[PDB]
Chains A and B, each alone.
Chain A
């Protein structure tokens, strides 16, 4: 989706920061101790 939008135009330097994905990843690391231990 984001890649398609960036292909329809130039958008070469706008690095996408998915807030939803980051929040879900943070919640997952908070909930599952093994993932938290291995990630950091």
Chain B
């Protein structure tokens, strides 16, 4: 009451306190919250010297140091948050040029060491100079010695301290090797990961299965079989990309009369004319003799606008009477009318650069048995370069060249599976023909594609692989080498990674619920024998792929994406089961906290480890629904922003340099350097640079936004259109842990928003509790 404070306290201090209370109230603070805030503030003022300049600066920088605390809105338990943040500030950490220069020079020397070693080995070019028998004997004894040493290192019993020292030494060696570029470093990391994984598997098989309790024995056997399958998949993946071929283009003969004939096919079913016009314009701009290149548009819709465009620009056009077998049948029907020596296929969205056939056809003219060449449409890029080593690079459905006679001999493109490309590649490989892969960008057109496309491809591919295995099994076939079979089996296993993930999700609950000992070993040994496996696998995969962002978190992304596609893949051979599993995991957490606070202290550490495991599971499960709600959320369209210097010429003769921000068939939006009073509706000329040439395009300014100017193209001609498409499209072109935590949290939030109500309540309560707990977490 105001009277009680007014009579109890002198009017000045009472006015000050009531003013602070009203300031709190106006910001939504409750009476209880504001009273508690005043109490805490007066205690802090009487105890903590907030008048001191240090505390003055702290209060001035209050928002930076205490992001999660609202000073204007005191809340219950706010002093707890203040104490937590003060402890973090005391514990946390808040000649530099010379040290930075030394560190950078050391890193640069580490990076450049392979080149120096390569030069040193080049002057002593050199086994390779011995006889056949001598080389065989030396290699045999060397391999035997190295294998025996590796076997000893795998199967050596250790105590915790020696084991920890071993882990630290191997991890340091792997980290040092990872800095060195080259294929030898990748080979060393592959061998080291193999050794560590073999050690882990041997320990699991010989010292972790519990042979007393039948239930624990069965659970351990199932988990160990899942781990063995995962290890086999990892080894096969290492084999696939152990040695990327890095194929380079063979120069064509300088006699242009010896070059072959190429038929470019652009099949479309429902794509608008705007999409296909760019591809056709780029195709006409491909640097290749005109009499040796024929362009075909294959429209299944019978659309008359496409026919008009084909007649105008001169490219051929064929529409079928029927529409069976979709794209594969369309191309098969079109093949009956083409007469070229090679058949190239481009998708509507893909933009073929003018240096495509020049960089591709050299190998066809050189190696006779080569029947297929694939160009990139990261991980996929390197799996296809590694496959080329074993001659297992398969048709990806677009941006490929196929020799005409082998294609007609195998009965054309296969039509028995959804993935006609992979089946065509398999049939070509079965007859002894060879396939290649060139890692040279075309124009890549579409940007991002989002997970909507990512899932389209991921699924249509799994179903096709399953069908191919069902009908044209690589293992039971004839005429395929061992490495090609290994690559195909690796793809199938990658698409079959659904059951081990479920076993991994259910095992920690199989401990926490039934009180079993699926992994009969002390938790410290479990950590010391499992962590090196995952760390070395992550390091080796990061080095092989070379991704800029590389950690276990990218692997978590891969697992959550592949777990979202497990039900469709297994169907090829949601809400209810999934929320059931999530509730199972949360009940596991509850019984785990019960065990930890009331169970015997001997099993406490094991309980904690299983807690960590279940937390990882809860992250993955939320990620799977987060992607299910983020797959259909992309609304933006094709927008590529690249820097390219252009010129704008006015009617007055003034010429201004500009940089193009974005572009489309409707026109281009550019950023103009300097000040220019360009008025809308004024016809200007846009000069674009192609190599050492300049092409002038007449445009009219339709929108000006400050220095950003939008221009629209007047009705263009054919040659002008080709020049435009050549100058625009056919060009020469702990944080992650928090990100995954946010992904899981938002997935759980969406699950609470959209699951059945009977679990909507549970998930809403859980999300509220998680948010309240996170509100106390210290922040930098």
- Chain A residues packing against B (C-beta within 8 Å): 1-5, 8-11, 13-20, 23
Contact = CB atoms under 8 A, between A and B. Distances in A.
Contacts of A20: 285, 287, 354
A13 B251 contact: yes
Interface of B: 248-252, 254, 256, 285, 287-290, 353-355, 358-359, 362, 440-441, 690-691, 731-732
B251 A15 contact: yes
B440 A19 contact: no
B355 A19 contact: no
Contacts of B731: 1
A28 to B, nearest CB: 13
Given A11-B249, A19-B289, A20-B287, A1 B358 contact: no
Nearest to A15: B251
A16 B358 contact: yes
Contacts of A1: 690-691, 731-732
Given A4-B732, A14-B359, A19 B287 contact: yes
A20 B248 CA distance: 24
A11 to B, nearest CB: 7
A15 B252 CA distance: 8
A9 B287 contact: no
A2 B249 CA distance: 14
Contacts of B358: 14, 16-17
A18 B248 contact: no
Ranked 9 nearest A-B pairs via Cβ = A4-B732, A1-B732, A14-B251, A5-B732, A13-B251, A19-B287, A14-B249, A1-B691, A19-B289
A13 B691 CA distance: 19
A5 B439 CA distance: 12
Main secondary structure of the interface of A (DSSP, over half): loop
Contacts of B362: 14
A20 B251 CA distance: 19
A4 to B, nearest CB: 4
A17 B248 contact: no
Contacts of A10: 248
B166 to A, nearest CB: 42
A14 B360 CA distance: 11
A2 B256 CA distance: 19
A2 B691 contact: yes
Given A15-B254, A20-B285, A20-B354, 4 more contacts: A2-B691, A16-B355, A19-B288, A23-B290
Contacts of B254: 15, 17
A27 to B, nearest CB: 12
B732 A18 contact: no
B736 to A, nearest CB: 28
B252 A2 contact: no
Contacts of B441: 5, 8
Contacts of B288: 19
B287 A18 contact: yes
Contacts of B250: 14
29 contacts: A1-B691, A1-B732, A2-B691, A2-B732, A3-B691, A4-B732, A5-B440, A5-B441, A5-B732, A8-B732, A9-B440, A10-B248, A11-B248, A11-B249, A11-B359, A13-B251, A14-B359, A14-B362, A15-B251, A16-B355, A17-B254, A17-B256, A19-B256, A19-B288, A19-B289, A19-B290, A20-B285, A20-B287, A20-B354
A17 B361 CA distance: 13
Contacts of B354: 20
B248 A9 contact: yes
Contacts of A17: 252, 254, 256, 287, 358
Nearest to B730: A1
B165 to A, nearest CB: 44
